[PDB]
Amino acid sequence: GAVQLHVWGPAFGLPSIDAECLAAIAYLAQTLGSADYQLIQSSPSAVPTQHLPTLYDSRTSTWIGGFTSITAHLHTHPPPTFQSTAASATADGTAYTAFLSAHAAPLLALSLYVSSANYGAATRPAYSAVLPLPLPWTEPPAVRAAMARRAAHLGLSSLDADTPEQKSRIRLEEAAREVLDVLAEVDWAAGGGGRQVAAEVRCLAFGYLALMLLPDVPRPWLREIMEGRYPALCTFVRDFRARVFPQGGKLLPWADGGAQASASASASASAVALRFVRAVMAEVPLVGEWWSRWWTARKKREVLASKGAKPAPSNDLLLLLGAGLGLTVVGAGVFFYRGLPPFGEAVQVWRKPV
């Protein structure tokens, strides 16, 4: 286990529920050996990068977050068991990676998270089934809010995701087509003809299309559109799944011999309590945003130090002593005020002048 990949738990008969995490899992399975990496089910609060998927290079103890960063790092520092118009192919791969991460993610967010019916039936149970007990009340809400913000530019809402209803279906179909037509020009099957893209691009495309197609939802507008209109993409997704993750991807080297047991290392009682507490203080109406900013800065400094940079020393001691001084001043003032004898008397009398 030279490198450890921290990803979400399995869902919808797939190794992971997140598109980027599934893409990273597929890339690792296709390139690295079975015993050269470990998969760890986790949540963003469990990793200092605060973002999944996250790779921890145990050879150097480096925290790398993001699918693109993980793929770039593994090319520069490959593990021992690594086996990955050339310029035009690289340019096409970069362009399609950017297009996927920029436009296919809002579509998946609209299908799974923005849609209230779909989120309340499959997505929320799937997220709650891969987290310890008190977490599903803090992390899935943040994930859903982030995905809704991602898909906000699409201009569609939960009501649209299903007579005005038939007008919304046209908008959904147009939004799906605007992405699927672009994605359909590439020969993701790596067969004869069509465009050619890198293995990383193919893995990312599968990661997005798998969550856009396979999950069974009460309102499968996206799955119906895909099956009806893009049989090539449906066949690519099915073949890639059946080739890379057979029997639901249970043969992957999950930590401690299982997906559920993998999370147990970082899901101790104290760790889960601390994560839940931090999530709670992050929502305080007054100091929540300041606490979140301080924690984010601390974790960013930790990640940079792990990478090898030399961040400026933190000024936490100065802030702590200033806050303590202010608290002591406030306490002294309130103690002076409390117990002060009344400023006047009940009766007040003035004698005649002398």
Binding site: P342, G344, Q348
Partner: protein
Amino acid sequence: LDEHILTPASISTLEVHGATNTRRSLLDQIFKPVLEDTAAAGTTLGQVLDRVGAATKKLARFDIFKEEGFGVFLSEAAPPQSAPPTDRTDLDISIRVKEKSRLVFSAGTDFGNAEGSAYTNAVVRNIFGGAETLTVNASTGTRTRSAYNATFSTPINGNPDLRLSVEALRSATQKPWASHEEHLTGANLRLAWLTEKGDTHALAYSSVWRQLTGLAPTASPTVRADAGDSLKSSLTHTFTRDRRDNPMLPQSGYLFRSVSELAGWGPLNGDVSFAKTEVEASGALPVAIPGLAGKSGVSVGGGLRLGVLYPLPLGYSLTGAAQPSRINDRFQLGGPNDVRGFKIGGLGPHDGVDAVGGDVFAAGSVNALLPLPRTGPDSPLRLQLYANAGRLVALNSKGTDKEGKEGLAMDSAAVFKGVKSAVGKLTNGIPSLAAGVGLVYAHPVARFELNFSLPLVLRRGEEGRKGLQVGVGISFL
């Protein structure tokens, strides 16, 4: 009694009850002058009683005591002083007063509902036992721009007349007439002062950050050009002489109000530099029909308001290039509390539908309150006929030639010529005039008025209302 006021008396002891949370120095500087006022020692029961009444009226000014709890007990002084110079010369009075609640906190909260509407009203009062008052008026909307207000008031050297206030505010004013909204964020420093004659001076320093945002889709190019960020650090002086018998229903007397403001010039620093002054003069003359007796209720009132906005350079020099005024500072005319018969901001320059302001204005009014039949003159109801008129013009540099490639900068001569032309434009032509009848309600908290208007003369692009128009508030033309 009628004959009791002849006997001279002297105030021996002054006792005050129910002031357990008030500093001695507060009552010290007000009650000794009452105490030693018996120097005359002649028919004092006809003068010291009113003196004590004035003293308790001054006591009411502190706001820290309950009005319904003002008590004054009087009793002849039992000690038989040797050789009394006059009858019952020894006299003591007793004053009993109950303080208001020391902390009022009207936390109307709807935290469960999305629209919080948490109008916190911390009115912490009488801190340090010297009539210091701290007021917090924080509020929130439907997760929109939250309001914020915090005022701290304190009398100076325990003088209820001279009062110093510090305020920090954050509001969002809506301006439907000009198709935008103003976001205000700044602090003030006022020094109010009540003269013994009854006048009210008020010197205030304000440094607010204005923001024009939320433009309506029908916003005019002028409003679009004036949108952005601005800071106004100004020093303003307000003087009021209200001799009217009833401010809500002025039947006799007069009112003179002057609001002079200097912004940006000299030590003050900001994005706008001007000298704005407004003068308001009002009056009312009762008309008693000789046939009827007592207060007839018929009066012939009037009014007159003037205002000049003079652009000034930024710096310590009176001779320099000055920027033209912005829509934030320009005057607005028209409405029920203004020249009647016109829409709110219905007078002055109009860019399309937006009511942009002007630099000088001159409003006037001639009303005549009339009592309703089968109704006493003391009744707040009254019938009114008005003849409101007004003008509102904007400054421009048409007369000045050779503006230059660099614009929006007028020299002293250009600004003076523009001001002269703007003032001259008031004299030529009939002012925007409207007349109508209506009923006025003299509710003590605020005046209510509903009238049937009919515009007569107005400039093109101005808005007038020909139907029933209602008006509430305390300031009317």
